[PDB]
Each structure stands twice: as C-alpha cells, then as structure tokens.
C-alpha cells in the first residue's frame, strides 16, 4: 500500500507542479490582444 | 445619578440626530462648508464633550 501511496503522491505533485508553474509563466500575456 | 444621566443621554441623542441629519445637508449644499465648517466642528466638539461628560457620570459619582 506504500508503493501505491508514493506513486499517487508523485503523480499529484507532478500535476500540481505543472499547474503552479504554468500559471506563473506569464499566463495573462497568453491572450489574443497581446502586441 | 440617574435621571441626570438620562437627560444627558437624551441631549446626546437629540444632538446626534441633529448632526446625522444636518451635517450632510449643510455639507453637500453649495457653499456652507467653508462658511459653516466652524459651526460643524463646534457641534462635533460639543458632541464629544457630551460623550466625555456621560463617561464621567456613568460612575454615578
């Protein structure tokens, strides 16, 4: 049960990290009125 | 001293009604702010003095 727990923790951390550092990547600029 | 406290609180309430009604009335009206802000501040000082007097007399002595 520990292996499943660490796999789930890794997956959740991976996707939350993608979310967090994607919204930090100048998300407001990604609009059709830029430039 | 009860009765005297009631009179002071009633005077404070009437003065508060007068302020709440009239201050915006003589405040928004054309002129009358630079003309009567001295009167406004005098009424506010009287209100604060009444508050202080009631604070002192709440102690019944």
């Amino acid at each position: 049960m520990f292996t499943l727990k660490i796999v789930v923790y890794t997956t959740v951390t991976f996707f939350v990290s993608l979310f967090t550092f994607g919204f930090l990547s100048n998300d407001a600029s990604r609009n059709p009125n830029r430039k | 001293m009860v009765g005297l406290l009631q009179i002071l609180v009633s005077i404070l309430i009437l003065l508060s009604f007068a302020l709440v009604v009239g201050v915006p009335v003589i405040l928004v009206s054309p002129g009358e702010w630079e003309k009567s802000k001295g009167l406004v501040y005098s009424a506010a000082g009287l209100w604060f003095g009444l508050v202080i007097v009631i604070a002192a007399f709440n102690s019944f002595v």
């Binding site: 520990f2 727990k5 660490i6 923790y9 890794t10 951390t13 991976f14 990290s17 993608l18 967090t20 550092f21 930090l24 990547s25 100048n26 407001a28 600029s29 990604r30 830029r34 430039k35 | -």
Partner: protein, 45 residues
C-alpha cells in the same frame, strides 16, 4: 502528520518534482526581460 507524510521516503518526490519543474520554469524566466513595467499585465514574453 504534516502533509499526510508518515514515511520519509514520501518527501523525496514531493520536494523533488517541483524542483525539476522549477528548473524548467527558471530557464523560461531567464529567457525573459525581467524589468519593471507600468501596466495591468506584462505583454512581453
């Protein structure tokens, strides 16, 4: 139990994966301009 962690091996991915994602994001951010602007948002990417 902080963050529901009862075994210390669980901390390795939780700390490690954000580090790698931050490395990629830091490459992206070092590619940027990184000077102050006066606007509601930065149009430079």
């Amino acid at each position: 139990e902080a963050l529901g962690i009862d075994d210390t091996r669980l901390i390795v991915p939780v700390i490690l994966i954000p580090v790698i994602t931050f490395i990629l994001y830091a490459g992206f951010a070092s590619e940027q301009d990184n000077e102050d602007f006066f606007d509601t948002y930065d149009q430079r990417r």
